[PDB]
Amino acid sequence: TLQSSHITEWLFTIHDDVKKRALECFLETAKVALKGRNKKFQ
Amino acid sequence: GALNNAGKGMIETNIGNYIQQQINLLEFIKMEMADVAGISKQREG
Known part of the structure; x- marks a missing residue:
């Protein structure tokens, strides 16, 4: 079944790229909320 | 006397042998x- 996982592996590699970039995008949004008087980050 | 006999006819086309031939190709x-x-x-x- 490993070679049948290769047929769909191309769909997962672009998915892990979006998850990589959306988490970098979430991290930069979170860096900006820090300077906004939110005591949750404490 | 075939008017009280002969059995009922069938309009049968054998398309299933043709369908199976295309499937095998x-x-x-x-x-x-x-x-x-x-x-x-x-x-x-």
């Missing part, structure tokens, strides 16, 4: 394409 062409690419059906799964 599709498995042949899908197999030849697999061999020329070096990517088996065992190699596809």
